[PDB]
A paper describes a structure:
Two of these IREDs were found to be active; IR-09 and IR-20 exhibited >95% and 47% conversion, respectively. Since IR-09 exhibited higher activity than the other enzyme hits, this enzyme was selected as the backbone for engineering. A crystal structure of IR-09 was available and used to identify activity site residues that could potentially play a key role in determining the stereoselectivity of the reaction. The crystal structure was obtained as a ternary complex with NADPH and N-cyclopropylcyclohexanamine. N-Cyclopropylcyclohexanamine is a considerably smaller ligand than 3, thus AutoDock Vina45 flexible docking was performed to find a suitable pose for 3. W204 was found at a distance of 3.6 Å from the ligand, and a similar situation was observed for M233 and Q234, which were at 3.7 and 3.4 Å, respectively. As a result of these docking studies, amino acid residues W204, M233, and Q234 were targeted for site-directed mutagenesis (SDM) with either alanine or serine as the initial replacements. W204A and W204S were identified as the most promising variants since they both gave rise to a partial increase in diastereoselectivity for the cis diastereomer and, most importantly, they both generated the previously unobserved (S,S,S)-enantiomer. Among these variants, IR-09 W204R exhibited the highest selectivity for the (S,S,S)-enantiomer, with 45% S,S,S yield.
Author numbering:
A (entry chain A), B (entry chain A): 1 to 284
Write the structure that this text describes.
Amino acid sequence: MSSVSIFGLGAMGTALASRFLEEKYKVAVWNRSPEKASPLLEKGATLSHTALDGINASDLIVICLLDNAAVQATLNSALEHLRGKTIINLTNGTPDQARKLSDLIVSHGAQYVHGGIMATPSMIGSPHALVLYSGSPDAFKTAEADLSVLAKCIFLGEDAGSASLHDLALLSGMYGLFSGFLHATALVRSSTPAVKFVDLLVPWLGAMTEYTKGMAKQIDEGNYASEGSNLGMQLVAIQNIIDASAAQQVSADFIRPMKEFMEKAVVAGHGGDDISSLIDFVKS
Amino acid sequence: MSSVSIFGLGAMGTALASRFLEEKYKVAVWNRSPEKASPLLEKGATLSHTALDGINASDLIVICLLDNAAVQATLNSALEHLRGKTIINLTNGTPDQARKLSDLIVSHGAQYVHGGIMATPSMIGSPHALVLYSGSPDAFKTAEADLSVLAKCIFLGEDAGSASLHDLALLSGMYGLFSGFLHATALVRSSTPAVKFVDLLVPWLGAMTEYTKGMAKQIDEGNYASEGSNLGMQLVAIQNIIDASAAQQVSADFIRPMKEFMEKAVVAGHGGDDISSLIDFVKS
Ligand SMILES: NC(=O)C1=CN([C@@H]2O[C@H](COP(=O)(O)OP(=O)(O)OC[C@H]3O[C@@H](n4cnc5c(N)ncnc54)[C@H](OP(=O)(O)O)[C@@H]3O)[C@@H](O)[C@H]2O)C=CC1
Ligand SMILES: NC(=O)C1=CN([C@@H]2O[C@H](COP(=O)(O)OP(=O)(O)OC[C@H]3O[C@@H](n4cnc5c(N)ncnc54)[C@H](OP(=O)(O)O)[C@@H]3O)[C@@H](O)[C@H]2O)C=CC1
Ligand SMILES: CNC1CCCCC1
Ligand SMILES: CNC1CCCCC1
Ligand SMILES: [Mg+2]
Ligand SMILES: [Mg+2]
């Protein structure tokens, strides 16, 4: 009685398909390279030999492809067969790509929800997974029970591009954290095992992640008066990081953006302010 | 009976001096701009009118100045009066600066410990504060009871530059996290309050901070085989972050280093590997 049709059997699409199968859904699967379907067919999925077969397999279509060019190309042949269906697009893309694809899909008589998967494939089906959704509220509402098999759901509203905006912002936070981890580990690699260093680093990153909640407060209030850690002193520290990196033949490129934004803010009069003040200098 | 002599009454030196006073130490204080001493003198500190007075006030000298040029300049007049003293230098600097200053100080008959304060001034005296120390093991041992008034202590060994290496690496981790927070908040600023967004961001950064412990494992083992999140797919995601940033007139400079390192690794054959593989590409 419960059915879904999946497009994309990469790492993530495979994990989606596997989870629906585990929960005894009727699951159709489609992939450009159809041999990625075999492990799923053995577990009870039906192969969509063509994209149109996948469109006709269910009124709930879940797409998870590399990029939204692949999504458009895959659907293009079948756009006249989308009437009445719900498209859940989990492909990473920009807000604008989701808004334009939403317009196209809605013009063909279907409804569109975009989703940003904040999880790795192994996390699918666990309480640690979260998917951010936006687009059709009606379609999300009627599909929510099915989507909750994959992950916790947060619905962000009717703008089809809001899920990808929030996804890409969360990923940009991640990439900053990973940039810092790689820089830090590279600096100590010749001295300390990385596993030994992360016993220092992880608690420290936790403490600095806590310093962010109040930074968000300062940002929402426009109040950057230093609480003890001024930018002049921080620019010296950053230059010491740059210089120590060079001495060890480690690249300091990860921290040069921060130095440049901090220098701009200091030129503008923030040498005695906190780092939240940089929010006004990250434009352009 | 318990005494200390502090050099530097900036934000951090003031917090050190205040904490020792609270614990009923005899505390001498020195600062280039001596009017920063008044709040401390009112609480029972003695003013060092000259650097030599500060050197002669105690055999435990704690220095906390902007940079190690200020440290050298401050001590230079008094180098012949350091015999028998312990210098605890908490000034941020490079490993080499600490090694050279250590050599100079030891040549003048004193002992030298460098310290990296992993705390803000308000954290001094709390269990959340940590100071990383390296240099003379004997001097650290006999001063440890006094230093523990400020913060938890970790001693890293006899290399006078190890405390600053580990400090600067931890700070580089911090700056990566803060780079990601600023990028993320800048992207959503026009859509969402920052305080609302951090309710998503903080748990997410926690989950990604956990992903780092296994990354350290992969690094120490040289084994980068993907567990589900390949670099080819990540480079697409990063480009989507760059493009979404431009559309919103937000700078994407924070993530360009990561894109460049990831592109280099993919050229070298890691398109199907995990992000830990970048550790070999952050050189130069
Ligand atoms: N950790 C993860 O892996 C996460 C992934 N995501 C997102 O999920 C999506 C899928 O990622 P993931 O499964 O990891 O990526 P993969 O690299 O494992 O798989 C990419 C998928 O896209 C397909 N594809 C690529 N180009 C085309 C094309 N031109 N036409 C049709 N299909 C094509 C591939 O088909 P083929 O098999 O034929 O090559 C494959 O199904 C991405 O948007 C990613 O950002 C989100 C969160 C986490
Ligand atoms: N959150 C923080 O504030 C933290 C700071 N630190 C480190 O602690 C150190 C002190 O930082 P903080 O107190 O915040 O910085 P401040 O900017 O508040 O104070 C800087 C101090 O250095 C002195 N100084 C600067 N140039 C000279 C000079 N040429 N000769 C003599 N003294 C000079 C200033 O004297 P004057 O008052 O006369 O200007 C002042 O005492 C730095 O190395 C920093 O990295 C470590 C961790 C956290
Ligand atoms: C040296 N820079 C400081 C370190 C402690 C946190 C705030 C910034
Ligand atoms: C889209 N890139 C992925 C997101 C989830 C964590 C690993 C990297
Ligand atoms: Mg392509
Ligand atoms: Mg100076």
